[PDB]
Amino acid sequence: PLTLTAATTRAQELRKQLNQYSHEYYVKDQPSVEDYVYDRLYKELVDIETEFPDLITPDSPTQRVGGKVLSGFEKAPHDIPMYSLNDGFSKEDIFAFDERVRKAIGKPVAYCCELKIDGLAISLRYENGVFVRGATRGDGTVGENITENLRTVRSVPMRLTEPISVEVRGECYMPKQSFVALNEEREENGQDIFANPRNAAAGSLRQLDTKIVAKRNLNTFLYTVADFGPMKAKTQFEALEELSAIGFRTNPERQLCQSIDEVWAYIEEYHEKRSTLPYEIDGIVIKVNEFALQDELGFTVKAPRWAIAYKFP
Template structure:
């Protein structure tokens, strides 16, 4: 067969197989037997092996292949993957509804969707082709798992239109696949996965795509990250567009026009939940209109236009055998219940948080009690109450110590706090927990340097503070138990890579009291360098949005310590970056620009700038770049083929520029 005839045959086979995959994996309506699909796939493989130049990136043969990876590369998300606020009962939902109505009035609708219990991922398409997929990670930076995501047959390698966009969804393991996987693991004498969510996450973080392919994962897409020129004006339209492009969405969604309909939907799926072929852990409720979503905006952690209702936690009974005390990085003592192992919400639980001494007294929890245990939000085990009627008289009351169990320093209870605290800054437990926090994913994100390795390094006295991490050598690490050449080199590479993190990662990692990851980003953007922040006064700090009195006092007190400056000097000497790498924040009133304080919307195709470049330049000049046009919009920049956003801008009388005018103003 000549090349031209082979090209025609390959195209025919690729088209057929992609269509059959869509029917089987997306629509759940197979039109041919598995044997026929397998026969056609074998034919395609033979043709592509004989004529490799005919192999395309969207060929069904490209779903599994490639070399085993050494590690996953980091990926910075174009827009953050935010978490949702939670509702646990009807009162929470009605409160959410009340706040929405106060903000946008009564003329709105909700879209209710099943909350899939899996792993959040983002998929990037360029000109219709799947080019990259990543995990959520910390919401800002995830891991590139493209090769593993390609093994999920419900993810299209080529869309039905040559469109460039980023979409988000939840990868999951169907119940049937989970049962089959655990059956195989048990036959091999291996530890089974605790639940389908863990199995899905573990499968997508396999370094060998061929292993991931055997896990039979699936996905539901639920959002478009950057709507661009799609013309979409609502969540329901966005989901319909995903359907048209060939993505798999969950068809059990429903548009509701009031909170009563939302509550009825929740009752329906609370009852039907066990009958689904996949796990769900709640219902996601979103305001449908994108314009109204923009009006509602965001808190520091989540959108105000969406909420996740979590199903009531499963409760079980077990025996509390012991109460252990753990000292955290801030010195707080947290009592933990040690339980007889019991299955709760799909996992075996042996420990549960008791929070503080007051809770133990309030619930009259005693060692030896029969207790009711649940998982808060289906995640964190906690003791709900005690079955006092089952007591035998052998139960023991628990007494909190007066000294730290780690360093024997006197414990104190600070004014306004319920927790006992060790205030010895040299307490080994606090130092160890601080080190664990420093290397965590949301802080410096040092791969392979987890809790166990940190504890071992601390025990061997190889590290005493975070600066010591950057002094570790190959010879020190190779001498440790279970540390081979490959793992040592991988760890040293990860430590080296962390030196280039932007300032906010280091700030959060240092564990300054009351400074969370969001506040660390704000401080880094405002001050630019660690040196500038260290010299900031209380007044300068409290003048910044999101920085309150308590946080400002904590920051000032932190930088007054001589040992802090010694530590920062050590980090700088080790090559750790102490500067912010993003665009600096400048007070709007100090920006001499037409765009300062204005809300700008970009629409249509730009030729001289990418959308992200235009957005960055505008934000640097004090603009707020929004995704949809509303009465609050000050300017719309319309590129080629501008659609409904331009029409709306004109109907509202909003100022409209073309790209040339934007470029001229940006140069001023």
């Protein structure tokens, strides 16, 4: 028989060890231990939580299966607005963007280039390391509060290793394989299929029963912060590294490009790498790397002047 005193301590040990394995597997996409190692520890933890339910915590990995059912979503304000992107569709559009940027800044400028993840924009707020809100972008200043759903998204950390208070933003999406699998399941049960993974991700995040969401195999790539503060990055490329460092999943395919020509080369590179990716992209996002230069260019009503989305036709 395990006592409550012994259980309380052991559960924390298990949470920590299981969450680390989960970080490796779900965020770094590189598990260190064999699944049975994880499964055996996880069952030990379930046994403890079953026997002493009071030991269940929000950062325990058993909570990933969800359980909550909402009546609706609360409004989720974004005091720091979530903008959208200006678009370009031609080589010319991208070079014109660069020409306008140089005209404004007065010198050559480096670009951080990222794949444009075809999904939904999300915002994740942490207080003292604890996940406390997840939100859709919505209309840019108000989205929906989908905190409970995002708890089931395995790459989203429930507790960061460092008790940092930050709100990070990125994309939540459904991998191609999961998209295919989910549509087959819908065909089998007489449901209408989703037209594409973007729509499947959106419908999934709109579900009110978290237990169903937990089954939809959603994933994330984080690419910015709303409010910096403790963050030390001074360039986007630094921001991507820092996001990884503090425990978020980031897309590995980014490159710091020192000329607009390098940018065009990146676009052509991944335009042909496109189909080999396990996820859908609808283009490339080109960002002015230096945050100080981003500030200098500012924002239109709709979008930053320091970035542009090259859309695949």
